[PDB]
């Protein structure tokens, strides 16, 4: 399946406003209030084809969003009895199989913490606390969920489909992980094995160590390589002389066959 997602942040400062858009794990647009002439801008080649009307509609939506988020920030201050800087984050996204909407998201956090989220039914809200219950009641009364659903099932699906056509050359690729194991004897006398997956796209991957058929492990987060691809590693500490009993297993949509690696 594929997703189209917007990640939005507003930050009060003793207010900066940013939007980023992604298809799957590729950023394709960005808006930043602190720019000299703030406007929506391309971050992938394939979106530059779009006409002037695309950019101006997007810029104007961003600017309206900015104003809504300034009110949001101010209101949240009141609900929580605060005086400092504060962040409101929003994510809105559709996940589509090949036209059916697998899953829709429309959710917010305040100061890094869950605030409110549209449920999987795309009809009801989950509020994190009694402040967020005030929003949930107002949004119930305004029919917010119906309009948010119509975006997620309508415009979001139709635009993802156009992006996937526009950027087909880059968006439909699957870059397999190139994997290897490194070995490091520790001054404590035992051995660190680390299983690396490099150069893969998309970001989703499974990386695990096994011993004698049983899953085991420090595992890092998928980190960007900077060129559109991802990296990940997983580590185990193993007794000296026992390295060969350990196998690293990697699965990723881009692979003819799951990888099994050993030192």
């Amino acid at each position: 399946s594929h997703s189209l997602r917007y990640f939005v942040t507003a930050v009060s400062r003793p207010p900066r406003y940013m939007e980023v858009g992604y298809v799957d794990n590729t950023e394709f647009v960005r808006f930043d209030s602190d720019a000299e002439n703030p406007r929506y801008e391309p971050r992938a080649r394939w979106i530059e084809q779009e006409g002037p009307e695309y950019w101006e509609r997007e810029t104007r939506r961003a600017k309206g969003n900015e104003q809504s988020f300034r009110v949001d920030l101010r209101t949240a201050l009141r609900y929580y009895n605060q005086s400092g800087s504060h962040t409101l984050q929003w994510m809105a996204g559709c996940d589509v199989e090949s036209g059916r909407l697998l899953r829709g998201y429309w959710q917010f956090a305040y100061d890094g913490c869950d605030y409110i989220a549209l449920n999987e039914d795309l009809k009801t809200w989950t509020a994190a606390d009694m402040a967020a219950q005030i929003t949930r009641r107002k949004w119930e009364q305004a029919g917010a969920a119906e309009r948010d659903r119509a975006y997620l099932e309508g415009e979001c699906v139709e635009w993802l489909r156009r992006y996937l056509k526009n950027g087909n050359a880059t968006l439909l690729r699957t870059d397999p992980p190139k994997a290897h194991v490194t070995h490091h004897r520790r001054p404590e006398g035992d051995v660190t094995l680390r299983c690396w997956a490099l150069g893969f796209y998309p970001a989703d991957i499974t990386l695990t160590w096994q011993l004698n058929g049983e899953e085991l492990m420090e595992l890092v987060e998928t980190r960007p390589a900077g060129d559109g691809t991802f990296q990940k590693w997983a580590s185990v500490v193993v007794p000296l002389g026992k390295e060969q009993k350990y196998t690293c297993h990697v699965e990723h949509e881009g692979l003819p066959e799951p990888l099994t690696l050993r030192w």
Binding site: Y6, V8, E19, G21, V29, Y54, R57, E58, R61, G64, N65, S68, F69, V71, D72, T75, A76, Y79, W90, A92, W106, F108, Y115, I134, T135, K138, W139, A142, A144, R147, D148, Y151, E155, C156, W159
Partner: peptide, 9 residues
């Protein structure tokens, strides 16, 4: 095109 957060907190 993209999403509008019309409804305020």
């Amino acid at each position: 095109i993209g999403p509008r957060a019309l409804d305020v907190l």
